[PDB]
From a paper:
A subgroup of PLA2s, known as PLA2-like proteins,is catalytically inactive due to lack of Ca2+ coordination related to natural mutationsof its primary structure; however, it is still able to induce a drastic local myonecrosis. The most studied PLA2-like proteins are the Lys49-PLA2s, in which the mutations Asp49→Lys and Tyr28→Asn impair the Ca2+ coordination. In this work, we report functional (neuromuscular-blocking and muscle-damage activities) and crystallographicexperiments aimingto studythe possible inhibitory effects of AA and CA onPrTX-I, a Lys49-PLA2 isolated from Bothropspirajai snake venom. The final models are of a stereochemical quality expected for structures with the same resolution, as indicated by r.m.s.d bonds, r.m.s.d. angles and Ramachandran plot analyses. Both structures have seven disulfide bridges in each monomer with the following structural features: (i) an N-terminal α-helix; (ii) a “short” helix; (iii) a Ca2+ binding loop; (iv) two anti-parallel α-helices (2 and 3); (v) two short strands of an anti-parallel β-sheet (β-wing); and (vi) a C-terminal loop, similar to all other class II PLA2s.
The inspection of the 2ǀFobsǀ-ǀFcalcǀ electronic density mapof the PrTX-I/CA structure revealed the presence of four CA molecules establishing hydrogen bonds in monomer A with Lys15 and Arg118 and by water molecules with Ile82 and Lys100. In monomer B, CA molecules establish hydrogen bonds with Lys20 and Arg118 by water molecules with Gly15, Asn17 and Ser21. Moreover, CA molecules establish hydrophobic contacts with Lys20, Lys115, Ile104, Arg107, Glu108 and Leu121 in monomer A and with Lys15, Lys20 and Lys115 in monomer B. In addition,three PEG 4000 moleculeswere noted in the PrTX-I/CA structure,with two PEGs inside the hydrophobic channels from both monomersand the third PEG moleculeinteracting with Lys7 on monomer B. The PEG molecules found in these sites are found in other Lys49-PLA2s structures. Finally, in the PrTX-I/CA structure, a sulfate molecule establishedhydrogen bonds with Arg33 in monomer A, similarly to sulfate ions found in other Lys49-PLA2s structures. In the PrTX-I/CA crystal structure, four CA molecules interact with the protein. Two of them interact with Lys20, Lys115 and Arg118 residues for both monomers by hydrogen bonds and hydrophobic interactions. Regarding the other CA molecules, an interaction with Gly15, Asn17, Ser21 and Leu121 residues close to the MDiS region was observed, suggesting that this CA molecule may also bind to the membrane disruption site of PrTX-I. The fourth CA molecule interacts with Lys100 and Glu108 residues butno function has beenassignedto these residues; thus,the binding of this molecule can be attributed to a non-specific interaction. On the other hand, light microscopy analysis of muscle preparations submitted to myographic experiments showed that CA protected against the myotoxic effect induced by PrTX-I by 40% and 65% (PrTX-I/CA at ratios of 1:1 and 1:5, respectively).
Author numbering:
A (entry chain A), B (entry chain B): 1 to 121
Write the structure that this text describes.
Amino acid sequence: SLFELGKMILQETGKNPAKSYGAYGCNCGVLGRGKPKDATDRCCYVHKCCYKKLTGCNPKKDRYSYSWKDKTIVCGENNPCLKELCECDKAVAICLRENLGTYNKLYRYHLKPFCKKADDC
Amino acid sequence: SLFELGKMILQETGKNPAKSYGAYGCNCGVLGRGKPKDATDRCCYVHKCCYKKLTGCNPKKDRYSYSWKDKTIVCGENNPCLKELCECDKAVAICLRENLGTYNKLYRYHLKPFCKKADDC
Ligand SMILES: O=C(O)/C=C/c1ccc(O)c(O)c1
Ligand SMILES: O=C(O)/C=C\c1ccc(O)c(O)c1
Ligand SMILES: O=C(O)/C=C\c1ccc(O)c(O)c1
Ligand SMILES: O=C(O)/C=C\c1ccc(O)c(O)c1
């Protein structure tokens, strides 16, 4: 759920997730996907495509278990859909950390209606 | 859908909805309901309770038509769920504008896990 996703983002990037990633570019936050603005935005694009493959669980509401081990996110067994969801969330947090160097505050609170259409997943 | 909601909020308040209301207090944004911190927060509490009562449509995903007429949000639906959804959204947008006078930025990115339990809807 959003609780685990936000926690993972905080753990990997060190940033308040809502402020930095709650609405960034065309893909981070609500309102689905759009042509990404930069690498950070592309992380969220991939993340949203990852969510589409999920079958049998709700990525927003369903909580799942994971551990912080050797400073790595380790997804619990959970069940197949929840493990897959956990893995989607883990990947986006890692991707956001790797791209922190080009994070641009101008894309914070980017008006998502002014995004071109995303390609299909 | 969230698109119409965000547009209404912008139309009523004049404010970028993500920046001002994407994570405000215990109820504005994602992660359920909590005891409201102030009037702005209480608008979002009422909104979430409004959504809870809906049957037959998806408040997040389902699009609906509305118009801007004499600077008033005018819902353009006869389907009972979409009409009620539109009115839910219109109400929160109006409420947020009406409570800009007590809006407090200290409640932006309020630590949502640490709110008190909301009264039942
Ligand atoms: O949105 C802004 O205009 C600036 C706020 C901000 C931007 C970057 C940070 O790392 C941070 O803690 C706060
Ligand atoms: O995608 C990868 O594999 C690289 C990033 C990485 C590298 C080390 C870690 O412990 C981790 O969680 C992520
Ligand atoms: O997204 C917008 O609407 C533009 C940015 C913006 C600039 C100043 C504000 O006070 C505000 O809410 C938003
Ligand atoms: O416009 C105002 O009345 C006050 C300033 C203001 C308004 C909205 C913001 O998100 C912000 O950082 C500052």
